[PDB]
Chain A
Amino acid sequence: PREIITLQLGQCGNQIGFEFWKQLCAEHGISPEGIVEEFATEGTDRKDVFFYQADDEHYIPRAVLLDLEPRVIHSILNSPYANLYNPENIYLSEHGGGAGNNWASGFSQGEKIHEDIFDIIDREADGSDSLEGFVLCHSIAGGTGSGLGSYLLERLNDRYPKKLVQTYSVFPNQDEMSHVVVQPYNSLLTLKRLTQNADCVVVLDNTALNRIATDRLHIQNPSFSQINQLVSTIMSASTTTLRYPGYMNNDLIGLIASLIPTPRLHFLMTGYTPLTTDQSVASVRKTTVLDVMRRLLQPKNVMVSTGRDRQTNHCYIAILNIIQGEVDPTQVHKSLQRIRERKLANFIPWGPASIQVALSRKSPYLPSAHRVSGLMMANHTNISSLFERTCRQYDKLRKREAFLEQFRKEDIFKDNFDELDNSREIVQQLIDEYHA
Chain B
Amino acid sequence: ILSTGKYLNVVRECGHDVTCPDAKEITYTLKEQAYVERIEKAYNYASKVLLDFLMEEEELVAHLRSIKHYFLMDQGDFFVHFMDLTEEELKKPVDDIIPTRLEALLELALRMSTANTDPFKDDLKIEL
Which residues of A come within 8 Å of B, CB atoms? 285-286, 290-291, 334, 337-338, 340-342
B window 8-28: CB within 8 A of A? none
* Contact across chains for A334 and B107 when beta carbons are under 8 A apart: yes
Residues of A within 8 A of B108 (CB): 338, 341-342
* Contact across chains for B101 and A341 when beta carbons are under 8 A apart: yes
A281 to chain B, nearest CB (A): 14
Contact with A along B54-77 (1 / 0, CB 8 A): 000000000000000000000000
Residues of B within 8 A of A291 (CB): 111
State whether the Cβ of B52 lies closer than 8 Å to any Cβ in chain A: no
Instruction: Name the residue on B nearest A334 (C-beta).
Output: B107
State whether the Cβ of B42 lies closer than 8 Å to any Cβ in chain A: no
State whether the Cβ of B93 lies closer than 8 Å to any Cβ in chain A: no
A284 to chain B, nearest CB (A): 11
- Assembled-state Cα–Cα distance A337/B101 (Å): 9
* Contact across chains for B105 and A341 when beta carbons are under 8 A apart: yes
- Assembled-state Cα–Cα distance A334/B122 (Å): 12
* Contact across chains for B104 and A341 when beta carbons are under 8 A apart: yes
Interface residue from A285, A290, A337, A340 paired with B114 (Cβ < 8 Å): A285
State whether the Cβ of B118 lies closer than 8 Å to any Cβ in chain A: yes
Interface centre among A286, A291, A337, A342 (most CB of B within 10 A): A337
- Given known contacts A285-B118, A286-B119, A341-B101, what 17 new A-B pairs fall within 8 Å (CB)? A285-B111, A285-B114, A290-B107, A290-B111, A291-B111, A334-B107, A337-B104, A338-B104, A338-B105, A338-B107, A338-B108, A340-B104, A341-B89, A341-B104, A341-B105, A341-B108, A342-B108
Q: List 9 A-B contacts (CB under 8 A).
A: A285-B114, A285-B118, A290-B107, A290-B111, A291-B111, A334-B107, A338-B104, A338-B105, A341-B104
How many interface residues does B have (CB within 8 Å)? 10
Instruction: Name the residue on A nearest B105 (C-beta).
Output: A341
- Assembled-state Cα–Cα distance A334/B107 (Å): 9
A294 to chain B, nearest CB (A): 9
Residues of B within 8 A of A340 (CB): 104
Contact with A along B19-53 (1 / 0, CB 8 A): 00000000000000000000000000000000000
- Assembled-state Cα–Cα distance A285/B101 (Å): 25
Residues of B within 8 A of A334 (CB): 107
Interface centre among A291, A340, A341 (most CB of B within 10 A): A341
A287 to chain B, nearest CB (A): 12
- Assembled-state Cα–Cα distance A285/B89 (Å): 28
- Assembled-state Cα–Cα distance A422/B119 (Å): 56
B window 93-128: CB within 8 A of A? 101, 104-105, 107-108, 111, 114, 118-119
Residues of B within 8 A of A290 (CB): 107, 111
- Assembled-state Cα–Cα distance A342/B85 (Å): 10
Interface centre among B89, B104, B118 (most CB of A within 10 A): B104
A343 to chain B, nearest CB (A): 12
Residues of B within 8 A of A285 (CB): 111, 114, 118
Instruction: Name the residue on B nearest A286 (C-beta).
Output: B119
- Assembled-state Cα–Cα distance A338/B114 (Å): 16
- Assembled-state Cα–Cα distance A338/B104 (Å): 5
- Assembled-state Cα–Cα distance A341/B107 (Å): 12
- Assembled-state Cα–Cα distance A286/B114 (Å): 12
Residues of A within 8 A of B107 (CB): 290, 334, 338
Instruction: Name the residue on A nearest B114 (C-beta).
Output: A285
Residues of B within 8 A of A341 (CB): 89, 101, 104-105, 108
- Assembled-state Cα–Cα distance A194/B53 (Å): 69
Instruction: Name the residue on B nearest A291 (C-beta).
Output: B111
Residues of A within 8 A of B114 (CB): 285
- Assembled-state Cα–Cα distance A4/B92 (Å): 53
Residues of B within 8 A of A342 (CB): 108
B27 to chain A, nearest CB (A): 50
3 A-B pairs closest in CB distance: A338-B108, A337-B104, A341-B104
- Assembled-state Cα–Cα distance A287/B119 (Å): 11
- Assembled-state Cα–Cα distance A286/B104 (Å): 20
Instruction: Name the residue on B nearest A342 (C-beta).
Output: B108
- Assembled-state Cα–Cα distance A291/B111 (Å): 9
- Assembled-state Cα–Cα distance A138/B104 (Å): 44
Residues of B within 8 A of A286 (CB): 119
- Assembled-state Cα–Cα distance A290/B104 (Å): 12
A189 to chain B, nearest CB (A): 47
A203 to chain B, nearest CB (A): 33
- Assembled-state Cα–Cα distance A338/B105 (Å): 7
- Assembled-state Cα–Cα distance A79/B94 (Å): 66
Residues of A within 8 A of B111 (CB): 285, 290-291
- Assembled-state Cα–Cα distance A328/B114 (Å): 20
- Assembled-state Cα–Cα distance A341/B89 (Å): 9
Instruction: Name the residue on B nearest A337 (C-beta).
Output: B104
A410 to chain B, nearest CB (A): 57
- Assembled-state Cα–Cα distance A341/B86 (Å): 10
- Assembled-state Cα–Cα distance A341/B97 (Å): 12
- Assembled-state Cα–Cα distance A334/B119 (Å): 13
A359 to chain B, nearest CB (A): 20
Residues of A within 8 A of B104 (CB): 337-338, 340-341
